[PDB]
Amino acid sequence: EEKKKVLTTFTVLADMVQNVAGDKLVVESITRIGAEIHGYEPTPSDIVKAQDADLILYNGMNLERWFEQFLGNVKDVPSVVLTEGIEPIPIADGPYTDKPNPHAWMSPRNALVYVENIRQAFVELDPDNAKYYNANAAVYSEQLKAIDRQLGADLEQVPANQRFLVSCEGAFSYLARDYGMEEIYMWPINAEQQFTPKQVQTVIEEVKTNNVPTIFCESTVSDKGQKQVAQATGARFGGNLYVDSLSTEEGPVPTFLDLLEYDARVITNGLL
Amino acid sequence: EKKKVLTTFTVLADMVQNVAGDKLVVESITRIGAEIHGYEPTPSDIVKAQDADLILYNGMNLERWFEQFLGNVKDVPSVVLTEGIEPIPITDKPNPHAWMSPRNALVYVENIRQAFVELDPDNAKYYNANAAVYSEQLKAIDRQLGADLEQVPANQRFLVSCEGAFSYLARDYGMEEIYMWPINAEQQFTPKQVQTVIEEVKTNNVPTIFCESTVSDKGQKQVAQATGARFGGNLYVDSLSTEEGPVPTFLDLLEYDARVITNGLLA
Amino acid sequence: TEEKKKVLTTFTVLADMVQNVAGDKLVVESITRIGAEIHGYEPTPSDIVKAQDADLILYNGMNLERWFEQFLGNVKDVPSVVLTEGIEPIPIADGPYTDKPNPHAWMSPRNALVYVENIRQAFVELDPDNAKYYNANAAVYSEQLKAIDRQLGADLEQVPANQRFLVSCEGAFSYLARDYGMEEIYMWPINAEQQFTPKQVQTVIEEVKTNNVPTIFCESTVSDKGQKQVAQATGARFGGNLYVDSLSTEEGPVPTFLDLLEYDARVITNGLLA
Amino acid sequence: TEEKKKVLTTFTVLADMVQNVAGDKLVVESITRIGAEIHGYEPTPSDIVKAQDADLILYNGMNLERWFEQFLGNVKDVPSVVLTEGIEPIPIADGPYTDKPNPHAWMSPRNALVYVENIRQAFVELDPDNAKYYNANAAVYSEQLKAIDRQLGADLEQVPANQRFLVSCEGAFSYLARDYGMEEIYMWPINAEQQFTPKQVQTVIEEVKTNNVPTIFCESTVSDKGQKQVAQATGARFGGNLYVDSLSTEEGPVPTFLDLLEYDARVITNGLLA
Amino acid sequence: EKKKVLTTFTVLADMVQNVAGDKLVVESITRIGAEIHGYEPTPSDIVKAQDADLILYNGMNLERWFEQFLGNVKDVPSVVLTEGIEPIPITDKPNPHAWMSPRNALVYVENIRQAFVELDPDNAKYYNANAAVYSEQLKAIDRQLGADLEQVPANQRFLVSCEGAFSYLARDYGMEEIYMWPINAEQQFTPKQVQTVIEEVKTNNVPTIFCESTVSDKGQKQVAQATGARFGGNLYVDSLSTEEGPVPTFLDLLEYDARVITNGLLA
Amino acid sequence: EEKKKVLTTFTVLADMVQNVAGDKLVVESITRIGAEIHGYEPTPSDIVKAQDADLILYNGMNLERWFEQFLGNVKDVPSVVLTEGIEPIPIADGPYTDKPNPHAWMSPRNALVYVENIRQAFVELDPDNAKYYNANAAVYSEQLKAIDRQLGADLEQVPANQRFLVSCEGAFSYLARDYGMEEIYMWPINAEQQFTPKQVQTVIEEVKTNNVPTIFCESTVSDKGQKQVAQATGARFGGNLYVDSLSTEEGPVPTFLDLLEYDARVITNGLL
Numbered sequence A, F: 001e002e003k004k005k006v007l008t009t010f011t012v013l014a015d016m017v018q019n020v021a022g023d024k025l026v027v028e029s030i031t032r033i034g035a036e037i038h039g040y041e042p043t044p045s046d047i048v049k050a051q052d053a054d055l056i057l058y059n060g061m062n063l064e065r066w067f068e069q070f071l072g073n074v075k076d077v078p079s080v081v082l083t084e085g086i087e088p089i090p091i092a093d094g095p096y097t098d099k100p101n102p103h104a105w106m107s108p109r110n111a112l113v114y115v116e117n118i119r120q121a122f123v124e125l126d127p128d129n130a131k132y133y134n135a136n137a138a139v140y141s142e143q144l145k146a147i148d149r150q151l152g153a154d155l156e157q158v159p160a161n162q163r164f165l166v167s168c169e170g171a172f173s174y175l176a177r178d179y180g181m182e183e184i185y186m187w188p189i190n191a192e193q194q195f196t197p198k199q200v201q202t203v204i205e206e207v208k209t210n211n212v213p214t215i216f217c218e219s220t221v222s223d224k225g226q227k228q229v230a231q232a233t234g235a236r237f238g239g240n241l242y243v244d245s246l247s248t249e250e251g252p253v254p255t256f257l258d259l260l261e262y263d264a265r266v267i268t269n270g271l272l
Numbered sequence B, E: 001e002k003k004k005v006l007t008t009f010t011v012l013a014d015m016v017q018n019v020a021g022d023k024l025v026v027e028s029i030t031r032i033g034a035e036i037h038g039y040e041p042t043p044s045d046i047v048k049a050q051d052a053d054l055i056l057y058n059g060m061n062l063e064r065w066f067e068q069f070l071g072n073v074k075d076v077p078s079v080v081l082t083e084g085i086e087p088i089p090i091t092d093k094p095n096p097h098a099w100m101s102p103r104n105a106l107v108y109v110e111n112i113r114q115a116f117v118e119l120d121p122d123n124a125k126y127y128n129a130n131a132a133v134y135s136e137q138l139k140a141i142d143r144q145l146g147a148d149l150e151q152v153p154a155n156q157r158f159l160v161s162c163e164g165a166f167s168y169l170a171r172d173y174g175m176e177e178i179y180m181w182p183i184n185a186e187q188q189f190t191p192k193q194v195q196t197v198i199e200e201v202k203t204n205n206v207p208t209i210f211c212e213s214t215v216s217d218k219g220q221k222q223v224a225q226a227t228g229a230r231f232g233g234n235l236y237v238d239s240l241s242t243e244e245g246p247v248p249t250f251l252d253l254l255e256y257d258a259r260v261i262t263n264g265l266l267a
Numbered sequence C, D: 001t002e003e004k005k006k007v008l009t010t011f012t013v014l015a016d017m018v019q020n021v022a023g024d025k026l027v028v029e030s031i032t033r034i035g036a037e038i039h040g041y042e043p044t045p046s047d048i049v050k051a052q053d054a055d056l057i058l059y060n061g062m063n064l065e066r067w068f069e070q071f072l073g074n075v076k077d078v079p080s081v082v083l084t085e086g087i088e089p090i091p092i093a094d095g096p097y098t099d100k101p102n103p104h105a106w107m108s109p110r111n112a113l114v115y116v117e118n119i120r121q122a123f124v125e126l127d128p129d130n131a132k133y134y135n136a137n138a139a140v141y142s143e144q145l146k147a148i149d150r151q152l153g154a155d156l157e158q159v160p161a162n163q164r165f166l167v168s169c170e171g172a173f174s175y176l177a178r179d180y181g182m183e184e185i186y187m188w189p190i191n192a193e194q195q196f197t198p199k200q201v202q203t204v205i206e207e208v209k210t211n212n213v214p215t216i217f218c219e220s221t222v223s224d225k226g227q228k229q230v231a232q233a234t235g236a237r238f239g240g241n242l243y244v245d246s247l248s249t250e251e252g253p254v255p256t257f258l259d260l261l262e263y264d265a266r267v268i269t270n271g272l273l274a
């Protein structure tokens, strides 16, 4: 017979689920690498091969604003939210200023429930392959638990009164909170965007108020804003941090687990 | 169907086209006359890239947006046409405008050739044949260029321009060089760089000065007004012109720049 | 217009890598002169003459050139640096030098980048006048290294994970295989005096079947006789030679380090394909 | 700081002679790459690639490089001069090319001087900027040519006039022997396609006895098999190889043109001695 | 009895001696402190030459009387110790004072070595051993020389002397050079050459100036009197000194000249 | 038995006689290449190996001033003058201003009598070998007759009103007269010498009076004088002409016959 078709909204999710599924399900990701996901716009093609899938996973917390309408044209397909159970961090200011922060995957302690929700989602869809999925989930959690200790151990070194993480959509609030870092971001969440210069302004000062050596951006949004801060208090522009999407198998962050390790050192060795 | 090759800009496009013959369909990411050092790829470009059977590029950080643009384009053969060429440094990063030098172009086409036979080896015979013929025209014109620029006497071989894109040209035919900014970049330039160029024309008596087709002329004109230095029009480096217009081909771009400068220091 | 400095390297691969950071600013030369066994080479006295007249001598380290220590000892003050510094070795599995570091590191473009940087620092101190060039060349070489790394991983990803087996004569490709997730099978760990043995070609004859590996390779500096053996008795296709410890002539493939990585992976990829 | 010009020569002997007038001012390179038959060489396409990229191409002429005419015809404007101009040839005795000029002229230091001068004129026009160097190098090379000429005539004058017999495989030494009054005996006039013949080795077997010649020589680019023949049947000692159409490696004798004349005469002199 | 080697002058004599060890008896034609470019061989010399088992010389027309002197000396092995070395030109004939450059001396001793084993091959082992050891000392001192002359800051590395015998030294350690006459010759010099040197000291502020032991100081002193430039004594190139006296060995000659110049531009 | 020992005063003679003697007599020359011969001073060695020779040839015309006294201490040896029969050219001025010019060998027409006198000298000394000596003399004359035509044919080209030969001891008067050349010399014959500057003066003017391009000197005397003239009317200093002695087998003029050919072209292609 044939293998079931699973479909995740974006790549970070796609890779997370690929570790739980092993060779048993064919897992594809809706969006296509380094694409803004917070507000992607689906094409008939994505809605037509979606209708031809056995299940659609998604993050929730309104990460994908475009999804409710997309799922809207798939009747033909159930869909599980991978955040089921996590206590969210509310946002800071602006528009959806008290709605959940969707970037909960950035906390390994939260990545654990994420795989749990993936597992439960499969165990049912393809019960015949319960064992595996379970074997694969155990292993993967074991790995998330591992990488989790390596991060606490990476960020501890930089002194507490220098633990400042500065970015664009500061979608790391979670990683922030896990290892006790203070957060400095130009905007709270992605959107129509185009950042005001009052924002890029607060950044110009908070980094002088706080003498932060390295600032970074991300592979989905624009570097134009931060670079300024790369031009205000000699701050060093680190490369890109990774959250709303991985990089290909070449280049860094080709797997979620790598995103985590990676983001961490360049932070760690950007504050040192 | 023929394979698709995509290159970062339009000088590369005319070059790799000449090697490709009617056996490949060759496409440039940037339009015509667009500043290439500082372009912001549209998702239109990203898709073009994905379906591309190969992507050629300059390297030497010429096209600064490429690490990023290639970031979001999985598997997709990627070669730098600059490999094997020695840079003149600029703070002291490499001057990417290597193609501006006939002797160097021979190795661009060389790397284009290597990459076309690794790609469509079924047509290997053609590429080499084209490349050999192209290479030969390259030689023919490298001379003539020398034969144009030597007329202008050794001590008035000053090449003033907006970006220092001509280092490899200057180098090749013993020309001193003067420019308002070394490399395109955040730019807007400064009043103090204009204050440096507007000095040479008198400190070395340069009748003629130029800019280039991808960057603003506003600044190089000041210098022209602040000094009895005629502002000759555009030079061409980062991009071509349209068939109508000068410089529709790389070779044309070469013969052209040299002729306008050569005369333009005469009288 | 004092002449240019003189830089000496152990083998031809290192010679092309440094010649690529130096440009026409230094004059790079090799001890071993093409396809020659670099691990147990025996320096003629011209070799020793050169060395004492060079202004700097650049070597791999990690005990690659086993003859260096001694060769070095007989030249008066002349500097020497190991391009290998900062690279974390893969240690050897068995044979003499059991847990000695695997020198074949340059075969890893990630690693090649640290090679090229140390060449850079060595040259700025050697000839600080021309620093600007070394950075500019190193920049450009570093950058072309990253291109092919990306391009290399993109070539070996084709062959499916359960067929990703790299059979060579020397385990000279252990870094390359770590980088692109291959399983290595070698006829002998590293080079050591005691010619490979028939339990060794034997072990290789079993790992192959055991994995139904379609193509098996040697390298251009060692004995094809043992690998050929496991070929006319296993059924595998003998791909030709891979290149690790030395490049090729102007003719033939691999006349440059970059060509070496490109070549090596291409003929591997299509080797285990069908 | 435009790079330096590029000069190409047919064979390695010419390469060392020109490299000696150019200095570090031009970059001299050879087509044929050591001990290789220079008379009927078959240019690979890299050879042809080089040629079209060189800024000047210097060749012997006198039909030495039989392949040149054709090789030349397929490169676009690039200059070519014959270093041989002004030298009065010795014509060939027999075989095809009967009365064709003997090209082996450089073997005569008197003649070498006209070689070196024409290299000089070619370079001043090529690169008039650096003229001063070419004269200064040519001066010094011309001068060291006169030393060894004097020194060469002083070496062959030892052996007595009625034993002054020079047996080689190719009559490549006819000028050398005219200069120092030797009688030449060759297995074949010049190189020609139709491998030497057994009436030829035969004629040589008779001229030797006929003159009780103690040592007989070959050259490093041709077949020792015929000369060795006339040796194990005549009783003469087989001196090794003389060097005409090509030099040697950094190792072995004759790594330079001057060393070539020195060597050639020394091993001849002591060859017919006792 | 040991073989006799004869060399044109006394710097060559100390060099070939060092290679020869106690296995050869080495003799110089010219005495000590004698102008070598312009000596007139006595028939005493001619006979010495005849019984010489070998004659070594500089070449590059250094010793202009040699074509003639060797004219009347039948069979007598003759080598130039200059073969393989590239000249700095001077009208534009080669500057013969090549030995003045450690990196060059290595090839003088090299040619001495080659010629000693072609001559007494029975003792070949010794020569090479000496030459290798001599060569090593050459290296040791080439450094130190650089390490002395770099102290004097890049823009006061001016070496003023009577003959331009130091070109290969100047070259080797980036020194500009000033001299009253390029090469010894008919000479007597001119008042106009003194008029050129007496200009540098002010046009480049040179505290110290020198002459050499084989040629007249009368002229270089004028310059010293016409300018606040202290006249440091003699430099040494064409010849040595006596054991008593500085510069009794080649190596000494090297270390010496460099030290006096280096300090002598200090203050 | 043994071969007879013949001894010539100087090298030009030595080589002349060596062609007539072939391998049959051992011929040595008293003086030793590029040596002033007009007034050499003999050493006991030269007088002792001379006493041990079977015959001593000499030029005559007082060329060798030192000879009468030398022959003085050889009793033990006869001696033939090789000039017997030649009509000499008297000198010009100075000391022996009307005594014969000894340099008669410079005329091939005179070199013929010279070999004749050598032949006659041998035919007797070693009659047993008459034939040879005669065969050798024929051949040699044949060669002198040859080279004689080549010279007339070499010097004709330069125009008559440019045929000026300038040297030191102008010992070429003979070569001068054979092919109609005018002669310009600093001194008429060698001697204590040390030339006055009144002489080197006449040369400075006669060359301007006569616009002579190249002047030369010789391998036995000093170049110091002429060089001046090499510094007075842009005159080109040619190398050395050869008369009172050859150069070794290396270098030019290793044989008399070569001296002649040689001297001629450099003259010829020094006036053109």
Ligand SMILES: C[As](C)(=O)[O-]
Pocket: A142, A146
């Ligand atoms: C020690 As573990 C990673 O297997 O639990």
Ligand SMILES: C[As](C)(=O)[O-]
Pocket: A152, A153, A156
């Ligand atoms: C990980 As901790 C508690 O050591 O800071």
Ligand SMILES: C[As](C)(=O)[O-]
Pocket: C129, E150, E154, E174
């Ligand atoms: C080191 As430096 C610049 O003195 O040559």
Ligand SMILES: C[As](C)(=O)[O-]
Pocket: B079, B083, B111, B114, B115, C258, C259, C262
């Ligand atoms: C890297 As390549 C482009 O020479 O094969």
Ligand SMILES: C[As](C)(=O)[O-]
Pocket: B150, B154, B174, D129
């Ligand atoms: C010929 As030129 C000196 O112009 O380079």
Ligand SMILES: C[As](C)(=O)[O-]
Pocket: D258, D259, D262, E079, E083, E111, E114, E115
């Ligand atoms: C000429 As040689 C002195 O190298 O043999």
Ligand SMILES: C[As](C)(=O)[O-]
Pocket: F142, F146
């Ligand atoms: C013609 As003839 C020289 O033999 O007399």
Ligand SMILES: C[As](C)(=O)[O-]
Pocket: F152, F153, F156
């Ligand atoms: C030799 As004639 C007479 O031709 O002048």
Ligand SMILES: [Mn+2]
Pocket: B037, B097, B163, B165, B184, B237, B238
């Ligand atoms: Mn540009």
Ligand SMILES: [Mn+2]
Pocket: C039, C104, C170, C172, C190, C191, C244, C245
């Ligand atoms: Mn190895």
Ligand SMILES: [Mn+2]
Pocket: D039, D104, D170, D172, D190, D191, D244, D245
């Ligand atoms: Mn030949």
Ligand SMILES: [Mn+2]
Pocket: E037, E097, E163, E165, E184, E237, E238
């Ligand atoms: Mn001197």
Ligand SMILES: [Zn+2]
Pocket: A084, A117, A120
């Ligand atoms: Zn649930």
Ligand SMILES: [Zn+2]
Pocket: A248, A249, A250, B075, C153, C154, C157
């Ligand atoms: Zn990939």
Ligand SMILES: [Zn+2]
Pocket: B086, C023, C024
């Ligand atoms: Zn360069």
Ligand SMILES: [Zn+2]
Pocket: C042, C043, C067, C070
């Ligand atoms: Zn050893």
